[PDB]
Design a protein around this ligand. Structure first.
Ligand SMILES: Cc1ncsc1-c1ccc(CNC(=O)[C@@H]2C[C@@H](O)CN2C(=O)[C@@H](NC(=O)CCC2CCN(c3nc(N(C)CCC(=O)NC4CC4)nc(N(C)Cc4c(C)nn(C)c4C)n3)CC2)C(C)(C)C)cc1
Lengths: 146, 109, 90, 102
């Protein structure tokens, strides 16, 4: 009940872009800080959408449940539109860490039901069986208020 | 009387605790909403929280007099709001969920 | 200006200091107190190559306006790169 | 805009960027900042292709499509040591391939 969208009845009309080469899952955040999945955008496709000012959005990889950057940030909130009515969010691949990128790539090229038949340290098992979950990254951003 | 209780404790409650359900808890304030033509088109605004207040206070006598007050709000939203208006899409979601749980409905005492 | 990286098998790598420092291990080993050359006895050169490749890409594409492309990891070397990157804290 | 390449001779490699407008002659002078030997004494190849000191990095291939930061292009080097020679030095490394459970 802290990182939520305000019950706003105002127009914004945002345009998504998916400039990332992945299948983006835009997720709208409820007025109670809950993940709401919307239609997926195939790589390199952009759709003009409407929205209300004060609603909050973050993007994900629909299949590998990775995070993405909207205008170089993890979160998106609509700006002030008048005379610039189409506020525009451009989604790109985050500058991933080499560990977590390699962590992703093994998950895609191994069946997740094994993961433990690879000769790696036990600490490195719960790194790949960690899975970039949405609300997993939410708790981090709830703290990030200062 | 158990049917005016399975609606109140189970059916009402799961619908009350829904994200799109917040405006459907209080009746319209046409002056602040900037539209006085609400009462002129809608003749039975007996819903939006009024459904709850009369349900605990046993004003609905049977298992169908109360359910019909539910349909009024859903249809009411359809009547005055153009099909595909965000407020309609919210009403459609509540009605969908209402039908999902009433299909295991108990016997009326 | 540049710092050399040596592999277990022997291949020498000349990258810029700032590029390598992106690794948290190279950051801590290159001295809070204090000379600029390090060798890894378990990081093979074929793996170390992708390490310096990730560096050029880690530097080139951080908070930049130009569409950030995906990173190529060959599947056979993916396991070794995980352990190396795990060790390099990057 | 800019090409990203990597120059090799025996177990040694250099990771650096350069502009398409520069010629191969301009690159050799930068090499002397790392390996400290005159550009006259070194000769760059493009994997069995002699490079002339007049054609730009563009004019000899090396585009932003083939030589990227994530997958740089390989370009070679040899020395003469008093007279002239010492091609070619091709010096790879091999990786364990097995996909146990992949
Ligand atoms: C193609 C594609 N590819 C990739 S993705 C994608 C994509 C993206 C987006 C979309 C569609 N896009 C959305 O999904 C946007 C995005 C995000 O932004 C959320 N989203 C919404 O649309 C949301 N909608 C909203 O957030 C706003 C909805 C309001 C309007 C304002 N309102 C409201 N209106 C009214 N009327 C004026 C109607 C009168 C009436 O008959 N009423 C009968 C109920 C009694 N009356 C009241 N009441 C009750 C009074 C009141 C009281 C008590 N207080 N207040 C203040 C008032 C006024 N309330 C509350 C409801 C949801 C909830 C529908 C999801 C689709 C696809």
């Amino acid at each position: 009940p802290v990182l939520r969208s305000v019950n706003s009845r105002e127009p914004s009309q945002v345009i998504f872009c998916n400039r990332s080469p992945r299948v983006v899952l835009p997720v709208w955040l409820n007025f109670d800080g809950e993940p709401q999945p919307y239609p997926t955008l195939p790589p390199g496709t952009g759709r003009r959408i409407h929205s209300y000012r004060g609603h909050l959005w973050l993007f994900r990889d629909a299949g590998t449940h990775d995070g993405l950057l909207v205008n170089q940030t993890e979160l998106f909130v609509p700006s002030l539109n008048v005379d610039g009515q189409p506020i525009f969010a451009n989604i790109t691949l985050p500058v991933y860490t080499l560990k977590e990128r390699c962590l992703q790539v093994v998950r895609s090229l191994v069946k997740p039901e094994n993961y433990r038949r690879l000769d790696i340290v036990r600490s490195l098992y719960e790194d790949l069986e960690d899975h970039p979950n949405v609300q997993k990254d939410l708790e981090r951003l709830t703290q990030e208020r200062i | 009387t158990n049917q005016l209780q399975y609606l109140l404790r189970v059916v009402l409650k799961t619908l009350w605790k829904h994200q799109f359900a917040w405006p459907f808890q209080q009746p319209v304030d046409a002056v602040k909403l900037n539209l006085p033509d609400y009462y002129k088109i809608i003749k039975t605004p007996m819903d939006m929280g009024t459904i709850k207040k009369r349900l605990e206070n046993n004003y609905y006598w049977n298992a169908q007099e109360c359910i019909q007050d539910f349909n009024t709000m859903f249809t009411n939203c359809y009547i005055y709001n153009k099909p595909g208006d965000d407020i309609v899409l919210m009403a459609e979601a509540l009605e969908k969920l209402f039908l999902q749980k009433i299909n295991e409905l108990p016997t009326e005492e | 200006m540049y710092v050399k990286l040596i592999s277990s098998d022997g291949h020498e790598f000349i990258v810029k200091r700032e590029h390598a420092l992106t690794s948290g291990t190279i950051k801590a080993m290159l001295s809070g107190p204090g000379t600029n050359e390090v060798n890894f006895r378990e990081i093979p050169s074929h793996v170390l190559s992708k390490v310096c490749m990730y560096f050029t890409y880690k530097v080139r594409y951080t908070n930049s306006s130009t569409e950030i492309p995906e990173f190529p990891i060959a599947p056979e070397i993916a396991l070794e790169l995980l352990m190396a990157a795990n060790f390099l804290d990057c | 805009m800019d090409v990203f390449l990597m120059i090799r001779r025996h177990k040694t490699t250099i990771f650096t960027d350069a502009k398409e407008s520069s010629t191969v002659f301009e690159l050799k002078r930068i090499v002397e900042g790392i390996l400290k030997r005159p550009p006259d004494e070194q000769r760059l190849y493009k994997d069995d292709q002699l490079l002339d000191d007049g054609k730009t990095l563009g004019e000899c291939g090396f585009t932003s499509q083939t030589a990227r930061p994530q997958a740089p292009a390989t370009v070679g080097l040899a020395f003469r040591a008093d007279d002239t020679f010492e091609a070619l030095c091709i010096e790879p490394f091999s990786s364990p391939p097995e996909l146990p459970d992949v």
